[PDB]
Structure 1
């Protein structure tokens, strides 16, 4: 499913991301924009053989099992394919573990490069939340 900007904001708000570990909702929207263009079915293969899955491009080296990332962990205890669902619950709950793991949202390269230090509130502006 390809979300609208406001629709995703609303889904993410309902799932407890709004200010989770101090990151306002705009940050999460901005990250999703640039990670996946709001498409839950986004996948991208990394140099190391790991793959990024879903709206927040969660990586199989640590966070999910795709059965093909030798030597990887599955720290969110989910199959990676669960991150591709139109229901963002699994992506959101795994994101919460990731963002709590010491690096905050710097774990998402695109957030660090495209969102961090920008006016992220722009991403939820105009939305009925």
Structure 2
């Protein structure tokens, strides 16, 4: 699926991601545009043999199990495939472990390179609040 834009904020706003660990909703939503262009089925290889899955491009080394990433820790106890679901629960739930891991949203390189320091409210502007 693909999401519209307000359309994700509300889910993201349901599942408890607004000011989750002080990150307002524009930060998540902004992460989801640039990680995946708003697409639950998104998958991209990384150079280390790992792959990133779904709306927030979560990673098979550390976070999920894809069976091809020799040393995976499956720190969300989960199959990486389950995170491509049109139901963002597993992604948002895993995303809430990651962000709580040390480095905050800097765990998402497109957040750092593209959201951080920018007025992340333009991403929730026009959403019915």
Q: Give the TM bin, normalised by the shorter chain.
A: over 0.9
Distance in 2 (CA, whole Å) between partners of 1:26 and 1:122 is 7
List per-residue Cα deviations over 1:28-51 (Å, max 9, x = no partner).
000000000000000001001000
Say what the alpha-carbon RMSD is for the aligned residues.
Answer: 0.5
Stretches of 4+ aligned residues off by more than 4 angstroms: none
SS at match of 1:52: strand
Runs of 5+ unmatched residues, structure 2: none
**1:71, 1:80 → 2: CA distance?**
14
Q: Secondary structure at the match of 2:29?
A: helix
Structure 1: 5+ residue runs without aligned partners?
Answer: none
- The 5 A counterparts of 1:24-35 are 24-35=24-35
Q: How many aligned positions are there? A: 129
Give TM-score scaled by structure 2 length: 0.99
> Which deviations, in whole Å up to 9, do the C-alpha atoms of 1:44-76 show, x marking residues without a partner?
010010000000000001000001100111001
Match of 1:56 in 2: 56
